[PDB]
Swiss-Prot record:
Annotated knockout phenotype: RNAi-mediated knockdown causes a severe reduction in fluid-phase endocytosis and phagocytosis. Also, recruitment of actin to phagocytic cups is impaired.
Parent sequence residues shown: 1 to 66 of 134
Secretion signal span: none
Assembly behavior: Homotrimer (via EF-hands 1 and 2); oligomerization is required for its function. Interacts with G-actin in a Ca(2+)-dependent manner. Interacts with F-actin in a Ca(2+)-dependent manner.
Entry binding sites for Ca(2+) 2: 46, 48, 50, 52, 57
Domain-level remarks: The N-terminal domain (EF-hands 1 and 2) is required for localization to the phagocytic cup, G-actin binding and activation of kinases. The C-terminal domain (EF-hands 3 and 4) is required for G-actin binding but is dispensable for localization to the phagocytic cup and activation of kinases.
Binding positions (Ca(2+) 1): 10, 12, 14, 16, 21
Segments forming domain EF-hand: 1-32, 33-66
The protein's name: Calcium-binding protein 1
Localization per record: Cytoplasm; Cell projection, Phagocytic cup; Cell projection, Pseudopodium
Function of the molecule: Calcium-binding protein which probably acts as a calcium sensor and modulator, contributing to cellular Ca(2+)-mediated signaling. Activates endogenous kinase(s) in a Ca(2+)-dependent manner. Plays a role in regulating actin cytoskeleton dynamics. Regulates the association of actin filaments in a bundle but not actin polymerization and/or nucleation processes. Required for host cell phagocytosis and macropinocytosis.
Length: 66
C-alpha cells in the first residue's frame, strides 16, 4: 500500500531491485514461473532498466504518474 514495499523487499538495503528481486516479490505470494512476464515486467517497472529498478524510478512508476 505504498513504496516502502520496494525498499522493504530489498534486504540488501541497496534501494534497487533487479529482475530477480521482482520475480521474488511475487513469488512470496505464490509459485508462478513467468520468463516472458518477468522480462517484460522487468523493463516495464524499470524506468531506465539498468540491471535493476531504483527506488526513485519505482516511486515515479507507481501509479504510472510519469
Ligand atoms: Ca535489493
Ligand atoms: Ca535501475
Amino acid at each position: 500500500m505504498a513504496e516502502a514495499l520496494f525498499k522493504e523487499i530489498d534486504v540488501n538495503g541497496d534501494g534497487a531491485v533487479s529482475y530477480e528481486e521482482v520475480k521474488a516479490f511475487v513469488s512470496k505470494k505464490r509459485a508462478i514461473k513467468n520468463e516472458q512476464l518477468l522480462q517484460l515486467i522487468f523493463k516495464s517497472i524499470d524506468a531506465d532498466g539498468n540491471g535493476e529498478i531504483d527506488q526513485n524510478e519505482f516511486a515515479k512508476f507507481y501509479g504510472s504518474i510519469q
